[PDB]
């Protein structure tokens, strides 16, 4: 939720400074890392009950 909030937050930015800076690529990596983490946690949860 905080990563998607910051990604949507950085689209209010005015058109000279609407930038693909160091922040944007790291936020994209943050979103994919968080989703990979919680999907893998779901799969090991599935292993545990079996």
């Amino acid at each position: 939720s905080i990563a998607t909030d910051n990604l949507q937050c950085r689209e209010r930015r005015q058109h000279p400074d609407l930038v693909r800076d160091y922040v944007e690529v790291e936020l994209l990596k943050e979103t994919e890392l968080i989703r990979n983490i919680q999907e893998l946690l779901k799969r090991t949860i599935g292993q545990a009950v079996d």
């Binding site: 990596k29 890392l33 983490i37 090991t44 292993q47 545990a48």
Partner: protein
């Protein structure tokens, strides 16, 4: 015969100990993977 009797009981004891071994292996993989995920997420946040 008693040899079949003892063989049957020890074979099921072996299966139970294999089950315990699998559970301990799963335990080790679980606490390793939690340490890995937590360290990676805090690193990327920094």
């Amino acid at each position: 015969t008693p040899e079949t009797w003892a063989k049957f009981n020890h074979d099921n004891l072996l299966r139970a100990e294999r089950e315990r071994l699998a559970s301990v292996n799963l335990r080790k993989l679980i606490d390793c993977i939690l340490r890995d995920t937590a360290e990676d997420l805090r690193l990327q946040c920094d």
